[PDB]
C-alpha cells in the first residue's frame, strides 16, 4: 500500500486514491498562509509573505490576472506563475474576441480542467500549488479556492497554507459580519487582517511581511505592499 501506488499520477491506489495528487496537496500545507474573503461590493486577498533570511526579500504571493481579477498563491510559486499566466491569457482572449470580461466562475472551470489533465496522463505531474481567486464581474464579488486536484470551490471566505485552519474557523464565525461590509473597503481588509492573524504563531505582521489585494464595484484589482499596508498592522 502507498509505497507501490505513489510512483506516478496515472496510478490509482487500492482504495481509489491518487497519492501523487495528495503529495502535491502537501506542498500547499507547507506553504505560507493566505486568506480570501468578500462582501457584496468588494473581494479581498490578504497574504503572509515568507522570507529565506533577514537579508532576503519576502516572496510575493499575489498576482494580478486582469483589471477585475487576480489571485494569491500557496505552494510552488513557479506553478502559480504558469497558472496565473494561463488565466491572464483566458481573460485577455475573452476581451479581444468577445469584448467581454471573463466571469470568475468560468475562470474557475478553466483552472479545474487545466489541472485535471495533469492528473490523468503519464509523465506529467500535478501542479504543486493552491490558489485563491478574487474578482468582480457582471454578478458581483467572487472568491474561489483552487486545489491542484482540479477541485475549485466558490466561497464567501477561506484560507490556505500552514495553520490556515485558524483563519478559516474565524471567518466561519465572522461570516454574518464581513459579508455585510458593503461600500467600505478598509473594513473588509481589517476583517481579512484579523483573520490572517489567527494563523500566526511564529511572528507578528510587519510592514514588509504583509501583502493585501482588493477588487470591487469601482475598484480595479490592486496590490498593496510595504508602507501602503502600514495602516492595517
Amino acid at each position: 500500500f502507498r509505497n507501490n501506488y505513489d510512483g506516478d499520477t496515472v496510478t490509482f491506489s487500492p482504495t481509489g486514491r491518487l497519492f501523487q495528487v495528495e503529495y502535491a496537496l502537501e506542498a500547499i500545507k507547507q506553504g505560507s498562509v493566505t486568506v480570501g474573503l468578500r462582501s457584496n461590493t468588494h473581494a479581498v486577498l490578504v497574504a503572509l509573505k515568507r522570507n529565506a533570511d533577514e537579508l532576503s526579500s519576502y516572496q510575493k504571493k499575489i498576482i494580478k490576472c486582469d483589471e477585475h481579477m487576480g489571485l494569491s498563491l500557496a505552494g510552488l510559486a513557479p506553478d502559480a506563475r504558469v497558472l496565473s499566466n494561463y488565466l491572464r491569457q483566458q481573460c485577455n482572449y475573452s476581451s479581444l474576441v468577445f469584448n467581454r470580461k471573463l466571469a470568475v466562475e468560468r475562470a474557475g472551470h478553466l483552472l479545474c480542467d487545466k489541472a485535471q489533465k495533469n492528473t490523468q496522463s503519464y509523465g506529467g505531474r500535478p501542479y504543486g500549488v493552491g490558489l485563491l481567486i478574487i474578482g468582480y464581474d457582471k454578478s458581483g464579488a467572487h472568491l474561489l479556492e483552487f486545489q491542484p486536484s482540479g477541485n475549485v470551490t466558490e466561497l464567501y471566505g477561506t484560507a490556505i497554507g500552514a495553520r490556515s485552519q485558524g483563519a478559516k474557523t474565524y471567518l466561519e464565525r465572522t461570516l454574518d459580519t464581513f459579508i455585510k461590509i458593503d461600500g467600505n473597503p478598509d473594513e473588509l481588509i481589517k476583517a481579512g487582517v484579523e483573520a490572517i492573524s489567527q494563523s500566526l504563531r511564529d511572528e507578528s505582521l510587519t510592514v514588509d511581511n504583509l501583502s493585501i489585494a482588493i477588487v470591487g464595484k469601482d475598484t480595479p484589482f490592486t496590490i498593496y505592499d510595504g508602507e501602503a499596508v502600514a495602516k492595517y498592522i
Partner: protein
C-alpha cells in the same frame, strides 16, 4: 525506477532537492549589494597546480548592466547564460532600453522548471533540473542595485547579501552580522575577500579567487588579478590592525 518529476510524500520534487545537494558541493560564491554598486566574488578552486587558473570562468557578463556568478555544476550554467544574454539583447531590440534585472532573472528561472519525460501542457525537452545556482547582480533605473539568487527550483530571492556553495551556511551567518544599508563599495569588496578567505580550504591569493562588480557608471567589470591583489594586501593590513 521512478519519474523525474515525482513529488515526495513531504511535497517536494525529488530531482530539485537532489540538485540542491550538488550545489552544496560547488565552489563558494558571494554577492554583496550596496548603494554604490554590487560586488560578486568567487572561489576558483583549481584541482591542480598545472591548471591555468585564469581559464576558470565562474563570473560572467550578461549585459553591460547585469553580471552573474555561479556555483555547482558549472557546465550546466552555459545554456542559462546564453539564454540570459539573448533575453537582455532581445529586450533591447524590441524596446530600445535595458531589461530590468528582475525580469532577466525571471526569464532565466522560467527555464528551470522545464524538465521531464513528455509532461502535459507544453514540450519541455530536458532530462533533469540544472545542477547549478546563480547569483545575478545588476542595476536598473526603477529598482537600482539588485542581487538575486536563482535556484533550480525556479524561485529567485532578492538579497542584500548572499553566499552559495560549500561554505554558504558559515558565510551567510558572517554576512548576517557584517552587512548594513550604508556600506561603501570598498567595504563590500574587502568583506567578500574576508569571508572567502574564511571558508576556503586554500589560502586566498589573487589566483584562486576573483572579484567583480557592477556600477551605474561603468557597468559590469571583472577585476584583473593585479587590482584584487592590492585589495587582498589592504584586507590583510586591516585585520592585523585589530
Amino acid at each position: 525506477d521512478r519519474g523525474v518529476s515525482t513529488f515526495s510524500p513531504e511535497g517536494r520534487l525529488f530531482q530539485v532537492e537532489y540538485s540542491l545537494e550538488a550545489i552544496k558541493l560547488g565552489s563558494t560564491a558571494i554577492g554583496i549589494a550596496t548603494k554604490e554598486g554590487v560586488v560578486l566574488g568567487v572561489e576558483k578552486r583549481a584541482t591542480s597546480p598545472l591548471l591555468e587558473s585564469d581559464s576558470i570562468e565562474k563570473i560572467v557578463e550578461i549585459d553591460r548592466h547585469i553580471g552573474c556568478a555561479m556555483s555547482g555544476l558549472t557546465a550546466d550554467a552555459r545554456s542559462m547564460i546564453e539564454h540570459a544574454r539573448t533575453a537582455a539583447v532581445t529586450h533591447n531590440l524590441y524596446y530600445d532600453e535595458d531589461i530590468n534585472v528582475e525580469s532577466l532573472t525571471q526569464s532565466v528561472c522560467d527555464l528551470a522548471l522545464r524538465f521531464g519525460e513528455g509532461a502535459s501542457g507544453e514540450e519541455r525537452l530536458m532530462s533533469r533540473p540544472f545542477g547549478v545556482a546563480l547569483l545575478i547582480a545588476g542595476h536598473d533605473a526603477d529598482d537600482g542595485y539588485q542581487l538575486f539568487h536563482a535556484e533550480p527550483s525556479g524561485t529567485f530571492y532578492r538579497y542584500n547579501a548572499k553566499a552559495i556553495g560549500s561554505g554558504s551556511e558559515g558565510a551567510q551567518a558572517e554576512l548576517l552580522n557584517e552587512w548594513h544599508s550604508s556600506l561603501t563599495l570598498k567595504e563590500a569588496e574587502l568583506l567578500v575577500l574576508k569571508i572567502l578567505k574564511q571558508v576556503m580550504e586554500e589560502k586566498l591569493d589573487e589566483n584562486n579567487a576573483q572579484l567583480s562588480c557592477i556600477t551605474k557608471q561603468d557597468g559590469f567589470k571583472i577585476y584583473d588579478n593585479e587590482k584584487t591583489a592590492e585589495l587582498i594586501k589592504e584586507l590583510k593590513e586591516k585585520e592585523a590592525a585589530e
